[PDB]
Amino acid sequence: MQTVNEMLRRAATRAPDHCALAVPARGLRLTHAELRARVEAVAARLHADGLRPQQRVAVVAPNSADVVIAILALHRLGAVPALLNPRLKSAELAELIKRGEMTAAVIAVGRQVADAIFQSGSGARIIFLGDLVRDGEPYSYGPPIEDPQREPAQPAFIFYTSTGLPKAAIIPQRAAESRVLFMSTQVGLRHGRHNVVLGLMPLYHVVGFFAVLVAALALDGTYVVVEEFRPVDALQLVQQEQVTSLFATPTHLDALAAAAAHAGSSLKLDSLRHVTFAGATMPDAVLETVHQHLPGEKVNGYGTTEAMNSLYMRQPKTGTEMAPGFFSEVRIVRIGGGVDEIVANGEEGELIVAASDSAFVGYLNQPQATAEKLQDGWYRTSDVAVWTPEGTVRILGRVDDMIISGGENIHPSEIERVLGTAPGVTEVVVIGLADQRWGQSVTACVVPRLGETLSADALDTFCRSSELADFKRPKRYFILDQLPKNALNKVLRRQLVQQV
């Protein structure tokens, strides 16, 4: 195999004096060589404090040079970093560290979340990030440390997914490579010092970590650190930094396209060759501004924390329609049936992908969840798809959001995309109320633009003019001043239902 440490280390030997990390704001640059030295020194410093290999350690921090150093230093020691979204509720992070049986937690959130841990229960050493690394500068003690043996199926890193409370997906050693290389086979990145990769994706997301951070370094390139996203600022980075590739969320891309469109030839974005994104949920409108207004080849990708990348499209026409590339094997089976029950072609079903090398090896301490998800060699996405006559896979929506109304499959995502273009709608979620006509009644929950009124009549009329087939039209509307959302801004479908 080739592990993360080994990928980064080989790079450092090929390009020791080349720029590895930049923070244009803060004015900090480290070569690959210098980043070894800092990773090494931390690794042994933590080692000198008791931490041994295979012990899980939490990392709760916004993107920064210092967290890149800390995460890699932990991998280099042999520890298993558990990367956690810093926007989670204090209570939730503590629960996931207790459930996690974790030896330490590296934190750069504030004093009040360190308190949450102080109580909480689980004896996990609370390490302040700035007690390890500040502005790329470690405080290091002890001799340098040995490189532990790593085994292909051995746990390497822990990323979190998301009913209630995110699950800790275990990423084995053997998975790093194809979690990086798919950026090359699918997206088109090649090895080389021209590589300048803008880090807009958070590091607690596998894409932000393997596909953006590790890729950048392992291709002997430069990771440009982005502590805080701002659309015009970010475009200045592309120009100033010679960014060659960018992997962004749909929301970022909307922002960047809108700025690019109101910069004009003002910004030189010529250096940028790859605009990548997971756009299954990307509305047609946003995608379009992306082709009109941003440069470089656009690639749409579908992936999961559990299996990384499973489908893609060069130069996408719509964001839902993709096709498997290198490393992947995929199938559409009957919902709730065995992994061998393929569908008739054109019937809807569950997207399952083969659980090859890139696959997670289970959820930490949730072997029931695991057995719902890894079956007879496959990984079950929980997403609904259909095969297009065109030979491509069309992702329709989550199995869990699917509305079954009078023996018929309805996907709220479709209906939400139409309704979201109705004038006066700022936000919409479609749920299936419990439930008649029967089984389930298609219902729309909509939030008006500031100061505007909506009426059920006018939205209905709008829907009537849309392309939706009869049965897909909402049977009811609730105009709300807002939708209840979690810590990470996801809509609480289970809960909204109750409230209506």
Ligand X SMILES: O=C(O)c1cccc(Cl)c1
If binding is defined by CB under 8 A, does position 464 make contact with a copy of itself?
no
**Alpha-carbon distance 196 to 220, whole Å?**
9
If binding is defined by CB under 6 A, does position 296 make contact with ligand X?
no
If binding is defined by CB under 8 A, does position 342 make contact with a copy of itself?
no
**Alpha-carbon distance 129 to 132, whole Å?**
5
At closest approach, how far in Å is the CB of 72 from a copy of itself? Answer: 18
Interacting stretch for a copy of itself, rule CB under 8 A, among 43-51, 354-362, 421-429, 462-470?
354-362
If binding is defined by CB under 6 A, does position 325 make contact with ligand X?
no
Bridge-based pairing state of the strands 378-387 and 374-375:
antiparallel
Interacting stretch for ligand X, rule CB under 6 A, among 71-79, 260-268, 295-303, 322-330?
295-303
Among ligand X, a copy of itself, none, what does residue 323 contact (CB within 5–8 Å per kind)?
a copy of itself
Number of residues that bind a copy of itself (CB under 8 A): 32
If binding is defined by CB under 6 A, does position 58 make contact with ligand X?
no
Binding test (CB under 8 A) with a copy of itself, winner from 120, 185, 318, 366: 185
Which residues face 262 on adjacent strands?
none
| Side-chain-side CA neighbours of residue 55 (13 Å) | 14
Our CB check for ligand X shows the closer of 124 and 307 to be: 307
Residues in contact with a copy of itself, shown as a per-residue x/- string from 201 to 220 under the rule CB under 8 A: -----------------xxx
Judged by CB under 6 A, the chain residues 262 through 291 that form the site for ligand X are 278
If binding is defined by CB under 8 A, does position 327 make contact with a copy of itself?
yes
**Alpha-carbon distance 445 to 99, whole Å?**
35
Interacting stretch for ligand X, rule CB under 6 A, among 75-83, 196-204, 303-311, 428-436?
303-311
If binding is defined by CB under 6 A, does position 214 make contact with ligand X?
no
At closest approach, how far in Å is the CB of 91 from ligand X? Answer: 25
If binding is defined by CB under 6 A, does position 303 make contact with ligand X?
yes
**Alpha-carbon distance 454 to 458, whole Å?**
7
Interacting stretch for a copy of itself, rule CB under 8 A, among 77-85, 174-182, 221-229, 263-271?
174-182
Among ligand X, a copy of itself, none, what does residue 381 contact (CB within 5–8 Å per kind)?
none
CA dihedral 421, 422, 425, 429 (to 10 degrees): -70
If binding is defined by CB under 6 A, does position 138 make contact with ligand X?
no
**Alpha-carbon distance 392 to 395, whole Å?**
10
Binding test (CB under 6 A) with ligand X, winner from 301, 349, 397, 432: 301
Our CB check for ligand X shows the closer of 207 and 442 to be: 207
Judged by CB under 8 A, the chain residues 141 through 160 that form the site for a copy of itself are 152
Our CB check for a copy of itself shows the closer of 155 and 324 to be: 324
At closest approach, how far in Å is the CB of 266 from a copy of itself? Answer: 32
If binding is defined by CB under 6 A, does position 178 make contact with ligand X?
no
CA distances (Å), origin 297, targets 193, 212, 275, 316, 329: 20, 17, 6, 10, 25
Our CB check for ligand X shows the closer of 207 and 269 to be: 207
Q: Residues 42, 133: contact at Cβ < 8 Å? A: yes
Among a copy of itself, ligand X, none, what does residue 304 contact (CB within 5–8 Å per kind)?
ligand X
DSSP-derived secondary structure for 413-424: HHHHHHHTTSTT
**Alpha-carbon distance 463 to 476, whole Å?**
12
**Alpha-carbon distance 244 to 274, whole Å?**
7
| Residue given tokens 């600022």 in the structure block | 233
Interacting stretch for ligand X, rule CB under 6 A, among 8-16, 66-74, 300-308, 380-388?
300-308
| Residue given tokens 């656009």 in the structure block | 298
Which of 322, 250, 284, 332 is CA-nearest to residue 467?
Answer: 284
Q: Is 353 helix (H, G, I), strand (E, B) or coil?
A: strand
β strands within 235-354, DSSP E: 245-247, 274-277, 297-304, 308-314, 321-322, 330-333, 349-354
Binding test (CB under 8 A) with a copy of itself, winner from 156, 168, 181, 225: 181
If binding is defined by CB under 8 A, does position 323 make contact with a copy of itself?
yes
If binding is defined by CB under 8 A, does position 191 make contact with a copy of itself?
yes
If binding is defined by CB under 8 A, does position 139 make contact with a copy of itself?
no
Which of 496, 419, 488, 484 is CA-nearest to residue 458?
Answer: 419
Chain centroid to CA 103 = 25
Among a copy of itself, ligand X, none, what does residue 301 contact (CB within 5–8 Å per kind)?
ligand X
Contact footprint for a copy of itself (CB under 8 A): 1-2, 10, 13-14, 152, 174, 178, 181, 184-188, 190-192, 218-220, 314, 323-330, 354, 356-357
Contact footprint for ligand X (CB under 6 A): 206-207, 278, 301-305, 308-309
